[PDB]
Amino acid sequence: SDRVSSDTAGNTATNTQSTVGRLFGFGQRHKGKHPASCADTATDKVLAAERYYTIKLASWTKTQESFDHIRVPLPHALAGENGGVFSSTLRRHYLCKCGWRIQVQCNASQFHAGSLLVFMAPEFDTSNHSTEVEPRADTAFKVDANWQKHAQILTGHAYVNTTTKVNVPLALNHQNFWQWTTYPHQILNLRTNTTCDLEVPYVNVCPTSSWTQHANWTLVIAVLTPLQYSQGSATTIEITASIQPVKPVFNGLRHTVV
Amino acid sequence: GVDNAEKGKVSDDNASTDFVAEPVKLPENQTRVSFFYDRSTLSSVLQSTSDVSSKFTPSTAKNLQNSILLTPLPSDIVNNSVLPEQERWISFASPTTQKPPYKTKQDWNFIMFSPFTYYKCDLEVTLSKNDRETISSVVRYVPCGAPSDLSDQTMPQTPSLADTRDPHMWVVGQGTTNQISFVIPYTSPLSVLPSVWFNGFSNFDNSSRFGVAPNADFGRLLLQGQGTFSVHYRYKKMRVFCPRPTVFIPWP
Amino acid sequence: GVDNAEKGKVSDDNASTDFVAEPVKLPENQTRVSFFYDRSTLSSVLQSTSDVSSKFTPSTAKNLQNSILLTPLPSDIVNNSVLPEQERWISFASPTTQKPPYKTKQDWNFIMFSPFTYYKCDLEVTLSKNDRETISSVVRYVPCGAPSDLSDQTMPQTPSLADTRDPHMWVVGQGTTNQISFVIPYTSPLSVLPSVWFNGFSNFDNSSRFGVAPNADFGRLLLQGQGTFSVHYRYKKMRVFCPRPTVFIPWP
Amino acid sequence: GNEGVIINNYYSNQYQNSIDLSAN
Amino acid sequence: GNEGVIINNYYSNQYQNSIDLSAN
Amino acid sequence: GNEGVIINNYYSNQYQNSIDLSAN
Amino acid sequence: GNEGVIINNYYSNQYQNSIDLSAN
Amino acid sequence: SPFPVTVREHAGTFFSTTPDTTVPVYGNTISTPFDYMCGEFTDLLSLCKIPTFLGNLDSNKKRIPYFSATNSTPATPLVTYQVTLSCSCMANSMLAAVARNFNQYRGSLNYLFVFTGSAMTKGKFLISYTPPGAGEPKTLDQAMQATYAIWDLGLNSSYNFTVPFISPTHYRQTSYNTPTITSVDGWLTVWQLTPLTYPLGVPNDSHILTLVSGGDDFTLRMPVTFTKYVPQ
Amino acid sequence: SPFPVTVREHAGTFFSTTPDTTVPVYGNTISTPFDYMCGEFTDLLSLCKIPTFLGNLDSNKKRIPYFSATNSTPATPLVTYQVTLSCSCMANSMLAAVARNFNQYRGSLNYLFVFTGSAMTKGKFLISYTPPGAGEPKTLDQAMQATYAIWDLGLNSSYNFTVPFISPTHYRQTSYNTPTITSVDGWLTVWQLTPLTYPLGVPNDSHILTLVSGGDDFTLRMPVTFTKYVPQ
């Protein structure tokens, strides 16, 4: 009952009956102040853009191992048509600045076992690691379609051919997942909770973002404990997410992209 | 006692929570970020075979250039760039041994321990000659993203590097102690610098090397005069943001 | 908004004049004339093959004299003058290459960027030996327009340049650091110096070289002792008057 | 951290350190 | 511009700098 | 013992000497 | 005799000079 | 007694930018009076704010301080300037000449256009500033989608257009090797909204002078030396 | 008049850790504003207190962030961690990563266990911390003889266990060549008190996540560099 929580955002509302609270990364919220690096008065407080956008993320099966994960580049994950007015406004602006409030959903039963780590990370590598090809605009910022394995990111992944890889011991896109818990996060333990609630402020190398070139935040869902269940229990276990851009700011109005 | 890690945060306990014990804390402040990074660590090496009174021309010799990019992150000549640029990975200098030295320049202590996503600081640089032969050298410091000006001498027998208003240093003689040190302010147009990765491109057609931020450095150092010089960085008034994972270490 | 450039002056606007915007200014004072010019820039080079204890005699060797005229503007031996004089133009040292070095001495940074017609300042001079052989040199500073006194030694085995009450410097030994620096006050009889052109003659029969002002310099430096020495100028308490065009730059 | 000299810095604070300024 | 030492100049001002004087 | 300089130490006391502290 | 420095001795008097003491 | 000293590791080093002075060898000297002087200025920024000419290309690829317009409305911009103090079109303006000696800038840019056609000539231009991210504007429809002002000819001859400082970073680079998101900031394009219109006996081509300078809140910082070149 | 100086015997020495500054060559420069930033932290201790994962061995000798328990009570501990910030099991935790850069530590250590089995699974564990001197505890009888807490599964999923700082010395070494009484401090072992118990249709193996971090009164001191290695 203290675990029943409702959250309104524009014309949308998330509801959960097993919340463990909302974690505020860095104990900060994006307040929506205009970037001091822009002279043009920003476009803001667009109610049609300050809502939750819900999307399906993945299917969790017994084959996923600890640290296999799924990445959701932001704001790009919502820069497509399904991003509604946030997207259509974003595409027509040079710069955007915002925070994120997110809830990832995933229910099992009292007879299933397993757990996920739900976290937000700034400057978290979202490029593909199954190839030695340089990441490009249309491949670097895409939501993972398949679970990513973990071994090849511990020391990073150089965009060089397999034989050169031998003489490259470390790449700057390395991610020591044993410490992924140092990022603002929550754990989705099947026996405890079917939802995780996070919120992070705006962080970047600069006042506002030229988003077309940079996915500054990444929502990541990684399994910590493999999914387990006995013969007879529901086999389809899926993961979903409600993503809300917090008080976004737009500057530099222009014609649309693509 | 019991708790719930799914909250994303659990209490920091001491022995008194579950047992008959007392807190045992003693004051200590050597863990402060400012204090920790406020010390000099080897971060680069430079080599020149040109005299002081000559035209500076970019060169490489066994993985050592006569100029460096001021950044704790790995840097090196990238895809035949004229001057070194920030790298995205480290490589062994040797094509066979699979053991260091690396061909890339960096502050190993920073790369191996930078549990933050962004940092801000001033940079204290120390340049030291590797042998005892009397030093005779000229160094030019170029602010972050400023013109390198790799031009000809405008006057005969003068060090082209000194032909600038950019901050430069000239040390020579029997009375000197073969080193140079100075501190430069943060000069990047970025508010804070990415300490490990930059999840994006640096130009508008997204054709740059993904992973490297635009102008994420403290400028460059160009050198002329004979010798091999080691470089140290010391991070003044250091400030870090957003905790993140450290480099992984092989399991014992 | 609309305006009329024919007035000879139009307003300095910010984004708020025509659009829904705010001023975005941040304090900054590195553009002050005093601060900008208050740094050392290479401005000359000197060479001598005579020992300290000998009679100073004007010489030239591959475009380098053993004395200089203290002025940021180009200077060189003009029409076989005994000592260098202010030039009215810059020439390549080489008769073929059509590339620098130039045979003329000047502060390239000043020539390339002097958006004013007149200037006033004190001069901080730095003289550095181009190699590490122990220095043994004597320099004589002669105020603007004062007698050069290129006389014989009055006593055997003494540096003739030191045989004066004019300010002079003597550096020598294993404990020195092969350089000299000092600051001299503005000494020209002119109230302010012309920074680029002087539209007139310097004597009464108008026979001098049109374009060069009379006594428009900070004096001269004569040197004896072995070696090649580079010179730097630093403009103290710099003051400039009457804005004017900068040197043209070829279209990209 | 790591400055422990009791006499004041010879170079003024504006020069010894970069100047911190808030844009808001 | 470009002087940032907090302790006063060792040489007096008359000597360190030329003396500025108005003729009127 | 064995310190006889009248002007104060250039490095602060925290840095010049280890810091003595009582655990009780 | 023969000491003519106006700033005080850097080393304390106990150390710079032997200590004069009367036995009575 | 003598003072004990610790000679630092940089002994004998000549720092070209140390904020300290050196030894005066001819002191107690009066600087020749100049109180009668006029025209003194103390900040180089003053220069940056003086509008000076942009170099536009001739039909013969010769540089001129103006562009042409006539009785028609092209589907493409009459002129296009990339906002960079590095733009070749402004290479010889005082603004660029000064900026070449500094590392970064911030603030407004003023693009001044002066109509030089006859008094009987009328017309309207649409001056647009397009921030980057989606490339250069290809049509009037796109150019109007960004920051713009409509300039109507008439009694007043010139139009003072401001390129607002819109940037992800507080400061931007004045030059670069390859364009980056911190050194290139979009485009200023001027379009013909309505055709230049006029009566008989009036030359078909009107010339519009083009100048640039820093705006009210424009600043530069970090004294540096630009890439040297051989004058010609 | 010039001041007499006594040049000390260490003239020209470069001290990497002198608590003094050097010569500023580009002063009066504004550090690009960053007041909009969030997430700043000023003490590395903050990191040490964030619970991160311990690496337990798989049945195939692969490293995993948890251990297994089932319907039985082994006569031996399910996991054993030697209390040393050097323990290989915590080699990749943030606590160890930070500690590798300091010489000594003092204070509490928090070992966090998160039960990930089904909601229908019950059971009790006995988490014990055995100080050294008499070797590792060989039986439950011995393990209970030292500092311990009984963890009962239920509504709350995790158990925050504290290894009290019990030491002959005020500070302890973070690493060592050979174990000494100042660098190795005993063992943390978790035993199955009652078997994990559950109904039909529930997998027999339950996974318990294991994490470590410094406690409330935990501190580190003396910045140092750890033994270098080649990443792989």
- Kindly report the three-state secondary structure assignment for every residue of B17-51: CCCCCCCCCCCCCCCEHHHHHCCCEEEEEEEECCC
Cα Rg for chain A, rounded, in angstroms?
Answer: 19
Contact H166 A255 (CB under 8 A): no
> Which strands, in side-by-side order, build the sheet including A53-60?
A22-24, A195-200, A93-105, A237-253, A53-60
Q: Which of E2, E6, E7, E9 to mutate to test the interface with D (most CBs of D within 10 A)?
A: E6
Record the tokens describing residue B200, joined without a space: 């994006």
Residues paired with residue C47 on neighbouring β-strands, in sequence order: C228
CB I86 within 8 A of CB I109: no
Question: Which residues of chain F neighbour D6 with C-beta distances below 8 Å?
Answer: 8-12
- The reply to whether I33 touches chain C by the CB within 8 Å rule is yes
How far is CA A191 from each of CA A187, H82, I112, I207, I217, rounded to the nearest angstrom?
11, 59, 17, 12, 32
Contact I28 C29 (CB under 8 A): yes
Subunits that touch chain G (at least 3 Cβ pairs < 8 angstroms)? F, H
Contact G9 H4 (CB under 8 A): no
Record the tokens describing residue A84, joined without a space: 């509604």
Q: How far is the C-alpha of C47 from the C-alpha of C221, rounded, in Å? A: 12
Record the tokens describing residue C8, joined without a space: 């000879």
Q: Strand, coil or helix: what is B223? A: strand
Q: How far is the C-alpha of A106 from the C-alpha of A193, rounded, in Å? A: 8
Q: How far is the C-alpha of C116 from the C-alpha of C194, rounded, in Å? A: 9
The residue type found at B73 is: L
Query: Which of A202, A225, A233 comes nearest I201 by C-beta?
Result: A233
- Surface of A (132-161) touching H: CB under 8 A: none
How many structural domains compose chain C? 1
CB I172 within 8 A of CB A201: no
Contact A224 I39 (CB under 8 A): no
DSSP state of A37: T
Contact between chain D and chain G (3 or more Cβ pairs less than 8 Å apart): no
Question: Which residues of chain I neighbour E1 with C-beta distances below 8 Å?
Answer: 28
Task: Supply the CATH number for residue C168's domain.
Answer: 2.60.120.20
How far is CA C231 from each of CA A41, A190, B158, C45, I106, rounded to the nearest angstrom?
52, 76, 9, 5, 59
CA distance F10 to chain B (A): 19
DSSP state of I103: S
C173: left (phi over 0), alpha (psi -120 to 50) or beta: left
Q: Which residues of C touch D (CB under 8 A)?
A: 26-27
Task: Decide the pairing of beta strands H3-5 and I5-7.
Answer: parallel
Record the tokens describing residue B236, joined without a space: 């003044």
User: Residue C196 sits in which domain range?
Assistant: 1-252
CB A148 within 8 A of CB A67: no
CB I150 within 8 A of CB I193: yes
Strands (E), B143-178: 168-172
CA distance I147 to chain A (A): 28
Query: Which of B147, B169, B187 comes nearest H175 by C-beta?
Result: B147
Q: How far is the C-alpha of B38 from the C-alpha of C74, rounded, in Å? A: 46
Closest C-alpha to B107, from B67, B144, B64, B70: B70
CB H113 within 8 A of CB B184: no
Contact between chain B and chain G (3 or more Cβ pairs less than 8 Å apart): no
> In this structure, how many other beta carbons lie within 10 angstroms of the beta carbon of residue C26?
18
Cis ω for the linkage preceding B101 (within 30 of 0): yes
CB I68 within 8 A of CB B226: no
CA distance A79 to chain H (A): 14
CB H175 within 8 A of CB B147: yes
- The reply to whether I24 touches chain E by the CB within 8 Å rule is yes
Q: How far is the C-alpha of A56 from the C-alpha of A146, rounded, in Å? A: 12
Q: How far is the C-alpha of C122 from the C-alpha of C49, rounded, in Å? A: 30
CA distance D6 to chain I (A): 10
Cα–chain-centroid distance for residue C138?
A: 20
Question: Which residues of chain H neighbour D12 with C-beta distances below 8 Å?
Answer: 19
B225: left (phi over 0), alpha (psi -120 to 50) or beta: left
Contact I170 F23 (CB under 8 A): yes
Residues paired with residue B142 on neighbouring β-strands, in sequence order: B220
Q: How far is the C-alpha of I149 from the C-alpha of I132, rounded, in Å? A: 18
CB H137 within 8 A of CB H129: no
Residues paired with residue D19 on neighbouring β-strands, in sequence order: I30
Q: Strand, coil or helix: what is I124? A: strand
Q: How far is the C-alpha of C37 from the C-alpha of C121, rounded, in Å? A: 10
Q: Which residue of E has its CA nearest to C237?
A: E1
How many structural domains compose chain A? 1
User: Residue A71 sits in which domain range?
Assistant: 1-258
Q: How far is the C-alpha of B186 from the C-alpha of B217, rounded, in Å? A: 9
Record the tokens describing residue C25, joined without a space: 């200014």
Question: Which residues of chain E neighbour H22 with C-beta distances below 8 Å?
Answer: none
CA distance F16 to chain D (A): 8
Which are the contacts of A205, defined by CB distance < 8 A and separation ≥ 6?
Answer: B118, B190, B191, B192, B193, B194, B198, B213, B216, H169
Phi first, then psi: give them for residue B46, nearest 5 degrees: -135, 150
Q: Which residue of B has its CA nearest to D21?
A: B191
- The reply to whether I229 touches chain B by the CB within 8 Å rule is yes
Residues paired with residue A74 on neighbouring β-strands, in sequence order: A217
Q: How far is the C-alpha of C249 from the C-alpha of H212, rounded, in Å? A: 17
CB I160 within 8 A of CB I232: no
How far is CA I55 from each of CA I79, I87, I152, I209, rounded to the nearest angstrom?
11, 10, 23, 10
Q: How far is the C-alpha of C211 from the C-alpha of I27, rounded, in Å? A: 38
- The reply to whether H6 touches chain G by the CB within 8 Å rule is no
Task: Decide the pairing of beta strands I109-115 and I206-214.
Answer: antiparallel
The CA-based diameter of chain C, rounded to the nearest angstrom, is: 82
What sign has the CA pseudo-torsion H223, H225, H226, H231?
positive
Q: How far is the C-alpha of A21 from the C-alpha of A12, rounded, in Å? A: 19
Which are the contacts of B2, defined by CB distance < 8 A and separation ≥ 6?
Answer: I151, I154, I156, I158, I159, I160
CA distance B90 to chain H (A): 24
Q: How far is the C-alpha of B43 from the C-alpha of B68, rounded, in Å? A: 10
- Surface of E (1-24) touching I: CB under 8 A: 1-2, 4
> Which strands, in side-by-side order, build the sheet including C67-69?
C67-69, C220-224, C136-142, C168-172
Subunits that touch chain H (at least 3 Cβ pairs < 8 angstroms)? A, B, C, D, E, G, I
What sign has the CA pseudo-torsion C100, C103, C109, C113?
negative
Record the tokens describing residue H141, joined without a space: 């429809």
Contact D3 I19 (CB under 8 A): yes
Q: How far is the C-alpha of C1 from the C-alpha of C19, rounded, in Å? A: 10
Question: Which residues of chain E neighbour C183 with C-beta distances below 8 Å?
Answer: 16
Contact between chain C and chain F (3 or more Cβ pairs less than 8 Å apart): no
Residue with tokens 């940074």: C109
CB H101 within 8 A of CB H227: no
Q: Which residue of I has its CA nearest to F16?
A: I19
Q: Strand, coil or helix: what is D15? A: helix
Cα–chain-centroid distance for residue I82?
A: 11
Contact C62 B172 (CB under 8 A): no
- The reply to whether H168 touches chain E by the CB within 8 Å rule is no
User: How many contacts (CB atoms, under 8 Å) link H and I?
Assistant: 49
Q: Strand, coil or helix: what is B161? A: helix
Q: What angle do CA H147, H152, H153 make, to 5 degrees?
A: 140
Q: Which residue of A has its CA nearest to I48?
A: A182
Q: How far is the C-alpha of C229 from the C-alpha of C171, rounded, in Å? A: 13
Resolution in angstroms, to 1 decimal, for this deposition?
A: 2.5
User: How many contacts (CB atoms, under 8 Å) link D and I?
Assistant: 41
- Surface of H (118-137) touching C: CB under 8 A: none
Q: Which of I10, I17, I31 to mutate to test the interface with B (most CBs of B within 10 A)?
A: I31
CB C178 within 8 A of CB B173: yes
Contact H165 A208 (CB under 8 A): no
Q: How far is the C-alpha of A125 from the C-alpha of F6, rounded, in Å? A: 59
Contact between chain E and chain D (3 or more Cβ pairs less than 8 Å apart): yes
Record the tokens describing residue A82, joined without a space: 């399904």
What sign has the CA pseudo-torsion I3, I4, I7, I8?
negative
> In this structure, how many other beta carbons lie within 10 angstroms of the beta carbon of residue I143?
22
* Cβ neighbourhood burial of G5 (10 Å; 0-12, 13-18, 19+): exposed
Task: Supply the CATH number for residue A185's domain.
Answer: 2.60.120.20
Query: What residue ranges define each of the domains in chain H, with the CATH number in brackets?
Result: 1-232 (2.60.120.20)
Q: How far is the C-alpha of I68 from the C-alpha of A225, rounded, in Å? A: 11
- The reply to whether I168 touches chain B by the CB within 8 Å rule is no
